Point group: D2
Chain length 258, copies 4
């Protein structure tokens, strides 16, 4: 099977990458960074995010694996000490696949679409920032404040969490909208995070300023002459390789509790 390995690029991560490549050489595995079937990321959740976006055009063809060389990650999630064990299992094909939902972002000026694994955010570009929030064609609120964040389920433990959003098991096909410092006095928003199912479309439309900072995961991205930003749960999913039981709620506990 074709595989590739990305590294965060520190000594630890690079050496482990080389050891894994060497270990893969003892089996019928070929290093292909153009059309891999298996993408191994070595570092942290940030490195994994790069790996996802490196290979988002071939998501249906790829199984992802994350190895943390620092503290536990939500995507990266395997210990370096177990890397020798994963070489064998991967080469022997002794693994299932689990899929997490993704977020589709559409930006209309022409249209550009993006996939987020964690979230997409909209901000300005100079203070607030006024947008009309439209849900399935019906105007829901006029938001004034710092920005808005639309998160996938696995992204709920990242930015969404810091903004007060709910943590959502990634088996739920949904997206979550959170507010960043909304003004409430004109001027009224819901306050609460909102959780939308598949096929719901949330649209953001400008009121005065048309120039926004739009993020997708770690990428951002000042958008000029924007007419609309559209969110919905993607038809596409990211596939992980597993291996062993490491439940989402254990990862939450291990990351935030103890």
């Amino acid at each position: 099977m074709k595989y590739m390995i990305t590294s965060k690029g520190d000594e630890k991560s690079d050496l482990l990458r080389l050891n894994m490549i060497a270990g893969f050489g003892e089996y019928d595995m070929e290093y292909d960074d153009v059309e891999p079937e298996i993408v191994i990321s070595i570092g942290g959740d940030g490195t994994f995010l790069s790996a996802f976006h490196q290979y988002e055009e071939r998501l249906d063809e790829i199984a992802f694996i994350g190895i943390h060389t620092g503290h536990l990650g939500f995507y990266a999630d395997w210990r370096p000490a177990e890397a020798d064990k994963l070489v064998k299992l991967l080469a022997k094909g002794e693994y299932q696949k689990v899929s997490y939902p993704l977020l589709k972002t559409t930006v209309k000026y022409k249209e550009a679409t993006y996939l987020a694994l964690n979230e997409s955010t909209v901000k300005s570009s100079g203070g607030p920032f006024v947008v009309d929030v439209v849900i399935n064609d019906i105007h829901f609120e006029r938001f004034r404040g710092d920005g808005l964040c639309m998160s996938t389920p696995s992204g709920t433990t990242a930015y969404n969490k810091s903004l007060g959003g709910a943590l959502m098991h990634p088996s739920i096909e949904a997206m979550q909208l959170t507010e960043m410092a909304s003004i409430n006095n004109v001027y009224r928003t819901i306050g609460s995070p909102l959780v939308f199912p598949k096929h719901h479309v949330v649209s953001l439309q400008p009121v005065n300023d048309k120039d926004f900072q739009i993020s997708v995961d770690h990428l951002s991205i000042l958008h000029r002459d924007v007419q609309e930003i559209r969110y919905e749960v993607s038809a596409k999913k990211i596939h992980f390789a597993r291996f062993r039981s490491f439940p989402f709620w254990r990862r939450v506990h291990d990351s935030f509790i103890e």
Copy 2:
């Protein structure tokens, strides 16, 4: 078809009930409050909650309808002026059914099970209140504070909202756990609301005190010699009659925005 009508019991609600009964008399509808197929509640969301619990042993056989004689409700949701129109549609059978998820609560001392339409909460009974929170058999956190709230999707606009939880579209089969004033210093909890899918079981277990106040919707309910409280999304659903499009997000907007 067998139907019944509950009233909040003010002049407005009682008179409208009598008018509807009279209106139902012009069709082939019989008033049966023992085995109704249609349960109409006239008043507010509180009245609807009573109606649900009045008839929870026959949920699979019943379609519910809410009429608000005061301000808009989430369950009660039809205007009094449209009551004549619903008599006809109901009697002619020109309506579909929509189903919302429910919350199953199990209390072990023997076991007692309950269904919540909004939420179930656990409190003490004397300050805090220490419970071990166990998710699918694995200890997640030791909670110390005022209490905990487990909410259905349609319940997310009630108590759950006041506690900082996310608002969840009721097409999502999930439950949401929120904290009430948790101590964080011993003593660590997640803080964030947690959203669980079907088949996840959240268990609360006592640390010292075994005497809790346990609520299910408007009912509560000091429980003595408790060993465990178990939560999961129920296999059972409440069925509403509809009629016309009145989207959840419109009801949210209409209730909280304008």
Copy 3:
């Protein structure tokens, strides 16, 4: 000087109490638990709270000292290992006094007044709980929800913190009001904690139910036939003995950060 020592009553605390009494016997110090000039509390913040309320009728005459036999406390704040050192300093009189503000609570049915070192809270007694909040004679809000908390500055790190209140340096003569799960839809409150200076009077008045649970620190206290609860910063202060610099913000860091 007359002194007394309260103990949390575990082996650790009792043995240290006896050792301190023995150590005080080597100086001109007499054990008087009726009219002490120095009150030493050995245990935690909870034990200190008992000590304060044991001796609140003689606050102007007493200097308090807290020794933690477990983890660091905000009032209790000295290590057991430094107990021998405090015996000498106390007996030699090598110490200044620092004063923290207190909260006066007045309950009118006749009137009863109380002093809080941490906070006073009002709850029901059966769900919510509706009160009119009146600030300096002008109606401010109708609160509906779980309850309200009025905190002193040193109390801001306790219940007030769990409810989302600001942490306030205890050199500021102020009180802070926080909400517990307020309904916002009728029904509107400020949401934000409110910080009042000396001479501001906040009054809570019943709307329907007149039977409340009223807490003062660890004491509570179901109040029957209540007409009004009044809050203001007390003219009275608690005096601590010091000794050495242990800044409030260090105690905050040491308790909540690392």
Copy 4:
């Protein structure tokens, strides 16, 4: 007395400015926009903020007045219909002065100091944003997130409120620090807003990136090669003219409740 009048610059505000100038012409009042003793601002709180910063070099010599031509403001606070009445009172000298605390911001690369009437904020410039928070020379926390906000008491109803801070009566000489989306997992902050008294110094120091967006009220202000940002309650105060009783808590009620 020398006076000047700033206008938000819409038809309403300009016409009222001209009418007031004409009205002032009937008394011994001279229009001086260089060295006024009275600064009248006509528009909203935003216009008032401009007026304050226009004249911050002569704060000890000036009494400010705000007139709202739209909805009620916290600084602007008089109705247009009462403008004729204020002309007379001002010209007759039938008014007291009330003072609110200000925030001093010091930025060290050389030093630059600023006065804020509402708040000063620090952000990046590219995501987070890591700063060491030092309180009175002792390291308090390493903050990672979107930014930080330091607010005066009258500023607590603005940005500070949207970030979850407490509302503080402006008779209290204090400043309030709030967090914007802090990461908590490395990586720990207090969470709670912090309220500091006069003479406390809060310092922000860079960890990696030295290029910040620094705001003072409506001004911002990308700062290059920054070593430190220092906050403390200013020795200087803004003086308002009054006139009549319009209590802070009434303004809060009138702005946010009803």
